[PDB]
Amino acid sequence: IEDYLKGKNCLASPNYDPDDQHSSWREDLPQFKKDREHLTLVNTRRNRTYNTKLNRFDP
Amino acid sequence: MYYIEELFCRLANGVLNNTGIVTDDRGDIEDDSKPFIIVAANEALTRLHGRFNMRNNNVVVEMQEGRTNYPLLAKYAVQSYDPNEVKCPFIMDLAGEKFAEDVIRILEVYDDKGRRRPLNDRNNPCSLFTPRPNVLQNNAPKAWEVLNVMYQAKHPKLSTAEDGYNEIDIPDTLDPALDAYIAYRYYTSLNTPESSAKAAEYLSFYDSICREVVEYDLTSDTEVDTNTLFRKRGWR
Amino acid sequence: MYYIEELFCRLANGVLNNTGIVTDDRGDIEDDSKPFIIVAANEALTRLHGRFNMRNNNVVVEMQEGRTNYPLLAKYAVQSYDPNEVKCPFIMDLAGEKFAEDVIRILEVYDDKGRRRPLNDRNNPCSLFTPRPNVLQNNAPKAWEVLNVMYQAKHPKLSTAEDGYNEIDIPDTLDPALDAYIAYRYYTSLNTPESSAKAAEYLSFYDSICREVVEYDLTSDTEVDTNTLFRKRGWR
Amino acid sequence: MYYIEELFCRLANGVLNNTGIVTDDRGDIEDDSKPFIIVAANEALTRLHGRFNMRNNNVVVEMQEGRTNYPLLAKYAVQSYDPNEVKCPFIMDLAGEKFAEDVIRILEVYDDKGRRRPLNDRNNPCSLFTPRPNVLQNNAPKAWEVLNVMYQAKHPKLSTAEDGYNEIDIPDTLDPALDAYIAYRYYTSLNTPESSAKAAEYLSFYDSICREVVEYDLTSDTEVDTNTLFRKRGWR
Amino acid sequence: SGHTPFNTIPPIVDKMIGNAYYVVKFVALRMPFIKNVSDNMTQLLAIHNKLTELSAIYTKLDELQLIH
Amino acid sequence: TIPNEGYCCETLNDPIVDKMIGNAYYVVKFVALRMPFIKNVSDNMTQLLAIHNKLTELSAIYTKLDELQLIH
Amino acid sequence: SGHTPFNTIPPIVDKMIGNAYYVVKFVALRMPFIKNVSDNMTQLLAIHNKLTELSAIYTKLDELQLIH
Amino acid sequence: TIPNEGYCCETLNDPIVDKMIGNAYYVVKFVALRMPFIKNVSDNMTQLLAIHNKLTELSAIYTKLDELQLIH
Amino acid sequence: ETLNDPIVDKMIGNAYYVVKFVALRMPFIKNVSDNMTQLLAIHNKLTELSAIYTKLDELQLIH
């Protein structure tokens, strides 16, 4: 969170991507999603449709 | 000042007691429909904070050379930012609560020198501009210029997820308005003529409560101050 | 700002909660029905940016010898022109900020030397003209003349493709207005008389939200400036 | 600025989603009914270009002795004319787009000498006349007289046939008006009381959008200029 | 409703510039003294670990030095 | 010869600048940025007080410190 | 709302002209120095990889000329 | 004779700066058009510092280039 | 005062930090470009410098 205390915040840096050059007007969000996929229980209120056939008296 | 859990209990034992969205004991809302209430709750709080100037908050912005637009977003704050993406954040919230990204309308801007910077003055050479409501533009960033922005702030977004915001801070006299608006959205979503008539009543009740607050001025919305133009104009 | 997926969730757990185009878990809209929402969403954003002057964006145009009409199209941008049929682009933009033809209405034009250029002044020989709303015409292209055009801009068009835009940047107080218009479009599509009555309610609600924002001026639409005619008229 | 193909996709995924005129996947319109949309589309574009002065175009006419009436038709242009029928065309479009025969109302006429020729002035001996809206009449053709005509131009006619015009160039804020008008014609053609009521709503919506554009002036329809009569009258 | 913090410009214990602010300025002007001690906190803790033993050695002033 | 000052470039444990002592924000920002130094001294104040009480004892040992080495 | 970039004309660290613009103008005047390095970077890079060998030659310069 | 100037034509990263220093847009466009030249030096700044650190080291050996060829 | 900052942001923007990075070390670049031809001369015959470098012991026997 407060990594700003350690410093190393100088704007003068050599890393730069010419393919993503932008002004201060452009603001966009990255493509990263689905960070954690937390554990959860199934919902019994809805009954999911069966998608396969099982032979009766299957061993 | 109560947690989000009490809101579900109050709604279950309140306006939404008769509907089936509550548990068997009418003590809580079903987990399958909790986000539905959250979306309505966030919408309702935004409307109240727009009509009434209940909350006023200020932020500190540090000017950086080479940048003329300073969006008031959470990712540019000194807290809850990505050091890999932005090298140096320019929004300082080192103490107190973190910046919740709740900017609605900019009121006034004061710099570190103690003077007042004119806002959206097209004829003023040294005036700031706002090309977007939540974006502050400076046309001459200096070496050590720091700006403080006073703005009308909405309530922070509520979320039932872990490490989210789960506290409600509104005046208690506006609680019936919150319940009426939430109930209005629920009943109007059923697409039922019987429920549609009920939904209209709740919306009117919500508006009736808000105008009652304005009539008696329970939020101290009005503001007056001693006249200073009398000396400025030299009336003496 | 938020992803279009959050918009899908908000619609799924919002006005469209009782529709057949949502998933069984109410988490997302049906994939085959997604383009229907996208078309409506872009239409709704255009109306909001027209009534409210929320976004003010500027572009840079370079005068080319022998050319008088300068359409503001992406095919003339440096980042999107085709060298096969275009000798050289005259609209300058960046790789990460490609021109998106978001021009709605031209506000002011300034040259590279800092002089304001009058627009549509028929009696002024040096004034510029706009035969079309998105076409800029200069009747005297000079050698090194470069023009900057500041205009009211619409939100960039959303697209489900990965390379296209997938974020929404509008004031959060207008979110109910966005949802109401999308709901109105959906219910109007259904020709059942019951849905027709429901559709009108959302459209009326959408109009009510817009006027409420204007009434309280939550987007800082109103603008004033210091008087300058007093000096120019010579009142002293 | 989009091709005619996107219009069918937008209508299929838009207002006309519910009707059966679209394919099974709601991705396109049936080929058996494509010309029906084209007729409505051409009608809708003419109405918009009449109410709003969006497009202004100019043509060059070369006077020919022995001819006093100069219709502004496509067959008299230097392009797309029959050399066997007309020996010498008098409409020059050597560069740029071909003459599309989109004349609605003549605004002003300037000759090659650089002066302004009065139009429809009955008391002026040297004034031009317009016996028909699309026909320009000159009562004294000279040897090398060339006239330039500035007129309000409608959108070129759209056609799905080969080598036709298949591009739409209208301001994006008028797109909802285009869809509403097309839907109005479709539903009103069914001669069904249920569809007739729906058709009336779309027509009102189309008119509502147009008046909204005028109210906020999104097309820059208004035009003002510096007063020149002050010096002409000798007020000094 | 609400006062902008940066709008600072409009007997014995109280201060004109602000009691809270005066303390902050007092500490700031003497920051290097604090930083010097903070940077050597481990060294001071090591001495403080057996500080009694050094005092006992100190208390024997002449006996420990006459042998040398 | 070109400007290099700025809060981002100054974000490190460096001595204060006398030019902007009168800047109210700068003084507060200076202390707030260096909070851990204050916290490190404060939470172990008891140890320093005992050491401060015995300054003379440590000084005397240092005075004859080199003689003590030869004793070992 | 908004400001056109081109209407430019309406201490020792704040330049009278735009502070960010001064750095850009500083580089533009001295452009040929940078471009001279840029196009000849491969030859310079072919030297940096083995600066140790060149240093070893220098430290024994007196040995170099006595081979005559 | 006839004019020949402009930005779209007769302009490239290879030619040199013109007399139009006063135009603010020209100098900004000048550097922006020649961005890759600046980038090439920037990301390889470490190598330049090492070479510049031994600038006089390579000057002395330059004085006897022909003499070193005799040994080889 | 002149407001030239918006032009830099509009035309360069994110790439301005690279310009500042290089401009901060201009004299280092200046001290190399002026004597560029000396480095090229060394690079011209750079191959035999390694040959001399790998036979140091061969020259020590005379020494």
Side-chain angles (χ1 to χ4, degrees):
Chain A
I1 304 178
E2 290 194 6
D3 304 330
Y4 173 84
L5 281 310
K6 79 199 304 177
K8 311 304 173 301
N9 304 320
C10 302
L11 279 315
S13 61
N15 55 332
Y16 161 75
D17 195 337
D19 304 359
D20 199 4
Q21 182 177 0
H22 63 89
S23 63
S24 302
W25 172 268
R26 208 280 281 97
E27 293 292 333
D28 192 5
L29 302 179
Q31 288 286 350
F32 167 75
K33 291 179 61 60
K34 308 182 181 302
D35 55 330
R36 177 66 63 78
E37 56 179 3
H38 298 257
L39 175 143
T40 177
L41 285 75
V42 298
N43 181 23
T44 328
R45 183 57 53 87
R46 62 167 189 86
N47 294 330
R48 207 164 184 178
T49 61
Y50 308 99
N51 60 274
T52 181
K53 285 297 181 299
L54 174 58
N55 298 328
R56 215 165 198 171
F57 306 96
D58 187 295
Chain B
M1 186 68 67
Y2 52 90
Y3 291 93
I4 194 178
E5 302 295 335
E6 184 174 347
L7 176 62
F8 298 151
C9 177
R10 187 161 58 92
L11 289 185
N13 300 270
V15 57
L16 301 183
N17 175 83
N18 177 258
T19 183
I21 214 61
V22 304
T23 56
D24 308 70
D25 54 355
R26 280 75 178 271
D28 196 1
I29 314 298
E30 308 295 335
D31 304 330
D32 310 358
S33 57
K34 284 191 177 302
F36 176 84
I37 303 302
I38 306 308
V39 174
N42 295 327
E43 170 181 344
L45 267 58
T46 304
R47 295 267 62 88
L48 299 183
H49 292 65
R51 302 185 59 174
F52 300 88
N53 196 336
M54 301 177 301
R55 295 174 58 94
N56 299 83
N57 293 332
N58 63 91
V59 298
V60 179
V61 184
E62 300 178 352
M63 294 289 98
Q64 303 176 359
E65 65 175 10
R67 168 179 294 270
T68 59
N69 304 332
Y70 294 85
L72 272 62
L73 301 182
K75 75 187 193 68
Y76 289 108
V78 69
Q79 295 180 353
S80 68
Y81 82 103
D82 196 330
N84 307 270
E85 301 179 0
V86 282
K87 206 163 186 299
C88 188
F90 54 85
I91 299 182
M92 305 295 112
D93 56 2
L94 304 171
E97 297 292 337
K98 54 183 297 183
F99 177 72
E101 191 187 350
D102 50 356
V103 185
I104 290 188
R105 170 179 51 183
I106 307 303
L107 297 181
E108 59 183 0
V109 176
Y110 282 82
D111 59 351
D112 55 74
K113 303 301 297 179
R115 71 183 64 91
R116 182 177 181 179
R117 307 296 293 272
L119 180 60
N120 296 333
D121 196 330
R122 188 163 55 92
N123 299 329
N124 196 320
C126 65
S127 178
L128 300 182
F129 296 91
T130 57
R132 290 149 61 180
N134 62 90
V135 175
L136 179 59
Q137 173 181 352
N138 180 23
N139 300 270
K142 298 307 177 181
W144 299 79
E145 180 171 345
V146 177
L147 305 181
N148 204 128
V149 176
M150 172 61 63
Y151 62 99
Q152 180 178 355
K154 53 176 294 299
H155 192 275
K157 179 183 300 300
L158 302 180
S159 61
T160 59
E162 299 179 357
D163 301 1
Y165 206 95
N166 60 331
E167 198 169 21
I168 301 179
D169 183 14
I170 61 172
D172 41 13
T173 170
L174 273 306
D175 293 330
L178 219 188
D179 299 1
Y181 193 90
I182 291 185
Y184 157 76
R185 181 53 54 87
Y186 172 81
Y187 284 100
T188 196
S189 61
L190 301 182
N191 307 95
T192 304
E194 289 76 6
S195 299
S196 300
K198 177 65 64 178
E201 176 181 347
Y202 284 145
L203 180 58
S204 301
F205 183 83
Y206 151 78
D207 180 73
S208 177
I209 294 299
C210 296
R211 294 186 294 100
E212 174 177 336
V213 177
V214 181
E215 174 183 355
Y216 295 88
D217 187 24
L218 300 184
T219 330
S220 302
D221 195 6
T222 179
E223 176 182 357
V224 299
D225 47 357
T226 62
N227 183 275
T228 178
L229 305 180
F230 190 85
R231 181 186 177 182
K232 184 181 303 301
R233 299 301 160 84
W235 276 97
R236 210 174 314 277
Chain C
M1 298 180 58
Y2 49 89
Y3 301 91
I4 56 182
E5 286 71 15
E6 181 170 340
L7 173 65
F8 292 158
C9 200
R10 189 154 55 93
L11 296 183
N13 298 268
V15 293
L16 304 182
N17 184 267
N18 197 22
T19 61
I21 63 176
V22 301
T23 328
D24 61 331
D25 57 353
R26 306 297 200 276
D28 191 5
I29 315 297
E30 288 293 337
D31 203 331
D32 51 358
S33 179
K34 289 185 178 182
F36 176 84
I37 300 300
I38 299 301
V39 174
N42 294 327
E43 173 178 343
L45 265 55
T46 303
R47 312 308 300 178
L48 299 182
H49 291 67
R51 304 181 61 178
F52 299 87
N53 183 263
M54 299 180 301
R55 294 174 55 93
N56 292 17
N57 191 21
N58 60 90
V59 79
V60 182
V61 180
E62 300 177 351
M63 294 288 97
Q64 292 183 354
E65 184 183 16
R67 169 172 293 272
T68 59
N69 299 334
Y70 295 85
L72 302 183
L73 300 181
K75 63 178 181 179
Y76 295 110
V78 62
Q79 296 291 344
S80 301
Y81 81 104
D82 188 7
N84 300 329
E85 64 275 22
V86 178
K87 177 58 182 58
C88 63
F90 55 89
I91 300 180
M92 312 305 300
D93 52 355
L94 304 181
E97 200 176 356
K98 307 177 63 179
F99 183 71
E101 302 177 354
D102 54 357
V103 178
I104 292 186
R105 170 180 51 183
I106 308 300
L107 294 184
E108 62 184 9
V109 174
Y110 282 87
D111 55 357
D112 63 333
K113 286 168 289 300
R115 307 194 320 271
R116 190 177 186 271
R117 306 300 295 271
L119 299 91
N120 302 333
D121 192 0
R122 185 161 49 93
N123 297 329
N124 199 333
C126 68
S127 178
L128 280 69
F129 298 89
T130 57
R132 293 177 176 85
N134 60 332
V135 173
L136 180 60
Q137 174 180 353
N138 179 23
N139 298 334
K142 311 307 294 179
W144 305 90
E145 188 177 15
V146 182
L147 304 183
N148 194 324
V149 177
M150 203 279 291
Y151 61 94
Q152 180 178 1
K154 62 171 296 182
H155 189 280
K157 179 178 58 58
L158 303 182
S159 179
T160 59
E162 303 297 331
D163 63 327
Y165 304 91
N166 57 274
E167 65 285 352
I168 302 178
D169 196 326
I170 56 179
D172 40 13
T173 177
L174 296 180
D175 289 328
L178 168 60
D179 303 335
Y181 194 90
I182 298 180
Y184 160 77
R185 181 55 59 183
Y186 172 80
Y187 287 111
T188 312
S189 63
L190 283 74
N191 297 268
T192 61
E194 177 65 24
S195 301
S196 300
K198 179 63 64 178
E201 177 182 355
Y202 286 106
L203 182 58
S204 59
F205 178 82
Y206 154 79
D207 182 70
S208 178
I209 296 299
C210 296
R211 297 193 300 100
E212 185 185 30
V213 178
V214 179
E215 174 181 350
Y216 296 91
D217 191 10
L218 300 183
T219 61
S220 300
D221 204 329
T222 66
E223 51 181 351
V224 296
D225 51 355
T226 54
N227 195 329
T228 322
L229 304 178
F230 190 84
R231 270 282 306 276
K232 187 154 57 64
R233 289 298 180 269
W235 280 96
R236 193 186 317 275
Chain D
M1 186 68 67
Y2 52 90
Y3 291 93
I4 194 178
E5 302 295 335
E6 184 174 347
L7 176 62
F8 298 151
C9 177
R10 187 161 57 92
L11 289 185
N13 300 270
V15 57
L16 301 183
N17 175 83
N18 177 258
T19 183
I21 214 61
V22 304
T23 56
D24 308 70
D25 54 355
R26 280 75 178 271
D28 196 1
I29 315 298
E30 308 295 335
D31 304 330
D32 310 358
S33 57
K34 284 191 177 302
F36 176 84
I37 303 302
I38 306 308
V39 174
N42 295 327
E43 170 181 343
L45 267 58
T46 304
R47 295 267 62 88
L48 299 183
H49 292 65
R51 302 185 59 174
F52 300 88
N53 196 336
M54 301 177 301
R55 295 174 59 94
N56 299 83
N57 292 332
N58 62 91
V59 298
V60 179
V61 184
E62 300 178 352
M63 294 289 98
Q64 303 176 359
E65 65 175 10
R67 168 179 294 270
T68 59
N69 304 331
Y70 294 85
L72 272 62
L73 301 182
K75 75 187 193 68
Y76 289 108
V78 69
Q79 294 180 353
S80 68
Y81 82 103
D82 196 330
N84 307 270
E85 301 179 0
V86 282
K87 206 163 186 299
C88 188
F90 54 85
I91 300 182
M92 305 295 112
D93 56 2
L94 304 171
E97 297 292 337
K98 54 183 297 183
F99 177 72
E101 191 187 350
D102 50 356
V103 185
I104 290 188
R105 170 179 51 183
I106 307 303
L107 297 181
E108 59 183 0
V109 176
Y110 282 82
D111 59 351
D112 55 74
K113 303 301 297 179
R115 71 183 64 91
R116 182 177 181 179
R117 307 296 293 271
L119 180 60
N120 296 333
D121 196 330
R122 188 163 55 92
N123 299 329
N124 196 320
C126 65
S127 178
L128 300 182
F129 296 91
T130 57
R132 290 149 61 180
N134 62 90
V135 175
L136 179 59
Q137 173 181 352
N138 180 23
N139 301 270
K142 298 307 177 181
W144 299 80
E145 180 171 345
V146 177
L147 305 181
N148 204 128
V149 176
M150 172 61 63
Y151 62 99
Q152 180 178 355
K154 53 176 294 299
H155 192 275
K157 179 183 300 300
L158 302 180
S159 61
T160 59
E162 300 179 357
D163 301 1
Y165 206 95
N166 60 331
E167 198 169 21
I168 301 179
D169 183 14
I170 61 172
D172 41 13
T173 170
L174 273 306
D175 293 330
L178 219 188
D179 299 1
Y181 193 90
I182 291 185
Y184 158 76
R185 181 53 54 87
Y186 172 81
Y187 284 100
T188 196
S189 61
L190 301 182
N191 307 95
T192 304
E194 289 76 6
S195 299
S196 300
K198 177 65 64 178
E201 176 181 347
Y202 284 145
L203 180 58
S204 301
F205 183 83
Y206 151 78
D207 180 73
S208 177
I209 294 299
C210 296
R211 294 186 294 100
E212 174 177 336
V213 177
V214 181
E215 174 183 355
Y216 295 88
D217 187 24
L218 300 184
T219 330
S220 302
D221 195 6
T222 179
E223 176 182 357
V224 299
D225 47 357
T226 62
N227 182 275
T228 178
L229 305 180
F230 190 85
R231 181 186 177 182
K232 184 181 303 301
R233 299 301 160 84
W235 276 97
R236 210 174 314 277
Chain E
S1 300
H3 176 252
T4 299
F6 278 5
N7 189 19
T8 63
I9 167 72
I12 303 178
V13 44
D14 300 351
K15 308 303 294 299
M16 303 63 61
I17 61 181
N19 305 329
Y21 180 79
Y22 178 75
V23 179
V24 178
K25 177 181 296 299
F26 175 84
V27 178
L29 297 181
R30 294 163 178 80
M31 189 55 189
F33 301 94
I34 303 179
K35 187 184 63 178
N36 181 27
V37 181
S38 179
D39 296 330
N40 305 272
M41 179 56 59
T42 62
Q43 291 75 353
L44 272 305
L45 289 181
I47 301 178
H48 180 81
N49 178 31
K50 53 180 180 61
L51 189 59
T52 61
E53 282 66 22
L54 290 90
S55 59
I57 299 180
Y58 162 80
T59 50
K60 300 176 178 58
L61 283 310
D62 306 330
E63 180 178 349
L64 267 296
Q65 61 91 12
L66 56 86
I67 173 182
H68 193 275
Chain F
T1 175
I2 59 181
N4 198 23
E5 299 179 352
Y7 289 94
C8 298
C9 298
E10 202 257 357
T11 316
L12 69 106
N13 300 325
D14 67 325
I16 201 178
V17 292
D18 55 352
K19 180 175 59 181
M20 295 185 171
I21 297 300
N23 195 327
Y25 173 78
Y26 175 76
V27 179
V28 183
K29 179 62 177 300
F30 187 90
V31 177
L33 182 57
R34 291 162 179 79
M35 179 57 60
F37 289 158
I38 306 300
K39 185 67 61 59
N40 176 266
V41 180
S42 58
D43 56 359
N44 51 27
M45 183 57 59
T46 60
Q47 297 80 338
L48 276 68
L49 295 180
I51 300 177
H52 175 271
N53 189 30
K54 305 170 61 178
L55 247 298
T56 61
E57 297 80 328
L58 271 300
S59 61
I61 300 180
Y62 165 79
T63 303
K64 58 176 182 299
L65 188 61
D66 64 86
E67 289 80 356
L68 299 178
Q69 166 56 36
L70 299 189
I71 305 300
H72 182 69
Chain G
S1 300
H3 172 248
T4 301
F6 270 11
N7 64 352
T8 64
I9 165 66
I12 65 178
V13 71
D14 298 327
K15 315 299 296 181
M16 184 57 59
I17 63 177
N19 186 22
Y21 168 79
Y22 180 81
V23 181
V24 183
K25 185 177 179 299
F26 179 87
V27 180
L29 302 183
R30 321 179 191 276
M31 182 56 185
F33 298 150
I34 299 180
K35 191 184 63 59
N36 179 268
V37 182
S38 180
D39 53 1
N40 296 269
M41 186 58 191
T42 62
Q43 299 80 355
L44 301 179
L45 190 60
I47 300 178
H48 168 269
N49 65 334
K50 55 179 193 60
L51 238 306
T52 60
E53 306 186 12
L54 306 181
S55 61
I57 299 300
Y58 175 84
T59 186
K60 53 184 302 300
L61 57 91
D62 50 357
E63 175 65 21
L64 306 182
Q65 85 285 340
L66 50 80
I67 316 297
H68 305 342
Chain H
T1 60
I2 54 183
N4 173 85
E5 298 295 344
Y7 286 107
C8 125
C9 286
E10 302 89 28
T11 305
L12 197 58
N13 54 270
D14 299 328
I16 336 97
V17 69
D18 306 66
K19 71 179 182 304
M20 197 169 55
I21 264 64
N23 196 332
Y25 177 81
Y26 175 76
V27 290
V28 176
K29 181 61 180 302
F30 185 93
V31 182
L33 184 59
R34 303 149 207 269
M35 189 71 257
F37 290 162
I38 309 300
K39 181 179 181 59
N40 183 27
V41 182
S42 64
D43 57 354
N44 296 19
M45 187 60 59
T46 304
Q47 289 73 10
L48 273 304
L49 263 299
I51 297 178
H52 176 265
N53 184 28
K54 310 183 66 61
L55 180 60
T56 177
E57 185 89 342
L58 278 309
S59 300
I61 185 180
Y62 177 83
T63 61
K64 51 179 59 59
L65 298 182
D66 54 74
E67 189 172 24
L68 265 297
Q69 184 57 222
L70 303 179
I71 295 92
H72 181 68
Chain I
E1 62 279 356
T2 311
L3 306 180
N4 303 123
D5 297 74
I7 299 181
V8 180
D9 201 325
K10 186 62 179 60
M11 299 300 302
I12 300 181
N14 186 26
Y16 168 77
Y17 298 151
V18 181
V19 184
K20 182 62 176 299
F21 186 88
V22 177
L24 193 60
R25 303 170 185 83
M26 180 56 58
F28 301 97
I29 307 301
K30 173 63 177 301
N31 296 327
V32 177
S33 179
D34 52 0
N35 56 85
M36 178 63 61
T37 171
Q38 285 72 13
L39 283 311
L40 270 301
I42 301 179
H43 180 76
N44 180 29
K45 59 175 179 306
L46 200 65
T47 163
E48 58 249 50
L49 270 303
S50 59
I52 302 180
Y53 173 78
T54 186
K55 60 162 58 181
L56 294 180
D57 299 331
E58 186 67 22
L59 279 71
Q60 298 301 329
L61 62 94
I62 303 101
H63 189 198

